[PDB]
Design a protein around this ligand. Structure first.
Ligand SMILES: COC(=O)c1ccc(CN2CCN(C)CC2)cc1
Length: 115
């Protein structure tokens, strides 16, 4: 509350660390469905069904341009990518499996790096 603060967590390295995690995600061999925006003109249903499309290149642009106010808003966009993937793809599909794999990969890096 007013004039009463928890000890200040060091956040000076968060931008650089999030960038490293994103780089490792971009270079994963199962990243290919998530590297670029899903083409809304070529994939039937996607625009209507998926209210907030998200992908690694959009996350990279937002990160490089100071559009994430903190750690958590970054993690929310990353998770949004895999939540969208689950909504639109069967678990037993290549893209479905890519999504589950990448989410697991992300959450480990997240925990090891910040928790
Ligand atoms: C993250 O990307 C997606 O969620 C996504 C991407 C592409 C398609 C188009 N499908 C064309 C037919 N193909 C057998 C499966 C992909 C659908 C969903």
């Amino acid at each position: 509350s007013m004039s009463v603060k928890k000890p200040k967590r060091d956040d000076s390295k968060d931008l650089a660390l999030c960038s490293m995690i994103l780089t490792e995600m971009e270079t994963h061999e199962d990243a290919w469905p998530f590297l670029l925006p899903v083409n809304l003109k070529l994939v039937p249903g996607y625009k209507k069904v998926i209210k907030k499309p998200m992908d690694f290149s959009t996350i990279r642009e937002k990160l490089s341009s100071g559009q994430y106010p903190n750690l958590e808003t970054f993690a929310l966009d990353v998770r949004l990518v895999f939540d969208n993937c689950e909504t639109f793809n069967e678990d037993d599909s290549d893209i479905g499996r890519a999504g589950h794999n990448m989410r697991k990969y992300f959450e480990k890096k997240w925990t090891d790096t910040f928790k």
